Design a protein around this ligand. Structure first.
Ligand SMILES: O=C1c2c(O)ccc(O)c2C(=O)c2c(NCCNCCO)ccc(NCCNCCO)c21
Ligand SMILES: O=C1c2c(O)ccc(O)c2C(=O)c2c(NCCNCCO)ccc(NCCNCCO)c21
Length: 273
C-alpha cells in the first residue's frame, strides 16, 4: 500500500536520523516528504493509543499534528520489516534555516524577530501538546519561502514533556546547556530556552556562540556583528548559566526586542520576494 499511494522523488537528506525523499501523493499532488528510519537505529520506542509499538518520533509527531501550527505534520506512517516510513508535509519551495543563514550571512533584526517569534510559537505548541523537541536549531527549521512560514522538523531526539529531570540527551553538543555538560542532567523548558538563545545568536551573528565545553560552561557571549543593545540582552538572558535565571517563553515573548513582530506574509514580501 506504500509505494502505490506515494511516488518517490529525489533524496532530500540523510545522516544520523535516516533518509528523507521528496514525494508526491497520488490522491492529489500534495508535496510530501518520505522519512525512512531503520529499526536497528531506534534507541527510543513508545506506544500509541491503540497500543502498537512505534518509534518515539511517531508518538510525538502524533501529539503535535492536530490542527495548524509551526510544526510539520505527520500525514501517515508505515512499518516495514527493518524500517519505519513516515509521510510528512513538504512546503514548496522550501529551504532550511541553516542554508538560509549560510547564504545571506547574519539576518536583519526585523527578519530574525519574525523567525524567532514563529519558533517560539512552534515550541509553545509542542510544550502544550506535552512534547519536547530537544534539538531546536537552524537545520531543524524549514522555511516555506512563499508564505514566510517557519516549520519544525525532526522529532528524533524528542521526549514527552515532564517536570522531573532528564538524564539523556541526543541533540547536538554545541547546542546543549551548561547543566548538561557539567552534571549530565537538565529540565526541559529551561534547556529549550538555552538552545533558543543559541538559535537567536546564530540568526543575528551568522554563527553559533560556543564550540567547546569550556566556552559553554563559561557562558561568555561575544558579538562579532553589530547587534542592538536589546537583542544582546535577550540572547544573554536565554544563555544565563543558572537555569532558573533564564526566561520563560512568556517572558521571551514579552521582551522589548520581541515587540511589533511582522506577520509571515509581510516577512516574505520584504525579505524573501
Ligand atoms: O526536507 C526535509 C524534510 C521535509 O521537507 C519535511 C519533513 C521532514 O521531517 C524533513 C526532514 O526531517 C529533513 C532532514 N532531517 C532532519 C535533519 N536533522 C539533523 C539532526 O540534527 C534533513 C534534510 C532535509 N532536507 C531539507 C532541504 N534542505 C536543503 C534546502 O535547505 C529534510
Ligand atoms: O551547527 C554546527 C555544529 C553541529 O551541528 C554539530 C557539531 C559541531 O561541532 C558544530 C559546529 O562546530 C558549528 C560551528 N562552529 C563553532 C565555532 N563558533 C564559535 C567559536 O568557537 C559554527 C556554526 C554552526 N552552525 C551553523 C550556523 N548556520 C550558518 C552557517 O554558517 C555549527
Amino acid at each position: 500500500p506504500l509505494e502505490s499511494q506515494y511516488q518517490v522523488g529525489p533524496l532530500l537528506g540523510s545522516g544520523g536520523f535516516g533518509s528523507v525523499y521528496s514525494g508526491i501523493r497520488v490522491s492529489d499532488n500534495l508535496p510530501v516528504a518520505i522519512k525512512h528510519v531503520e529499526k536497528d537505529r531506534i534507541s527510543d520506542w513508545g506506544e500509541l493509543p491503540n497500543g502498537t509499538r512505534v518509534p518515539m518520533e511517531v508518538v510525538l509527531l502524533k501529539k503535535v499534528s492536530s490542527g495548524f501550527s509551526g510544526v510539520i505534520r505527520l500525514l501517515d506512517w508505515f512499518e516495514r520489516p527493518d524500517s519505519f516510513v513516515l509521510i510528512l508535509e513538504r512546503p514548496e519551495p522550501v529551504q532550511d534555516l541553516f542554508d538560509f543563514i549560510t547564504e545571506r550571512g547574519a539576518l536583519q533584526e526585523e527578519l530574525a524577530r519574525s523567525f524567532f517569534w514563529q519558533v517560539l510559537e512552534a515550541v509553545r505548541h509542542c510544550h502544550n501538546c506535552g512534547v519536547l523537541h530537544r534539538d531546536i536549531k537552524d537545520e531543524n527549521i524549514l522555511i516555506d519561502l512563499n508564505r514566510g512560514e517557519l516549520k519544525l522538523i525532526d522529532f528524533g531526539s524528542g521526549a514527552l514533556l515532564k517536570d522531573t529531570v532528564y538524564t539523556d540527551f541526543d541533540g547536538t553538543r554545541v547546542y546543549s546547556p551548561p547543566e548538561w555538560i557539567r552534571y549530565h542532567r537538565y529540565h526541559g523548558r529551561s534547556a529549550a530556552v538555552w538552545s533558543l538563545g543559541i538559535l537567536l545568536y546564530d540568526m543575528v551573528c551568522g554563527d553559533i556562540p560556543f564550540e567547546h565545553d569550556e566556552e559553554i560552561i563559561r557562558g561568555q557571549v561575544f558579538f562579532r556583528q553589530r547587534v542592538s543593545s536589546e537583542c544582546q540582552h535577550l540572547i544573554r538572558w536565554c544563555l544565563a548559566l543558572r537555569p532558573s535565571d533564564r526566561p520563560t517563553f512568556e517572558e521571551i515573548q514579552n521582551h522589548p526586542w520581541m515587540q511589533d513582530v511582522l506577520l509571515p506574509q509581510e516577512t516574505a514580501e520584504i525579505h524573501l520576494h
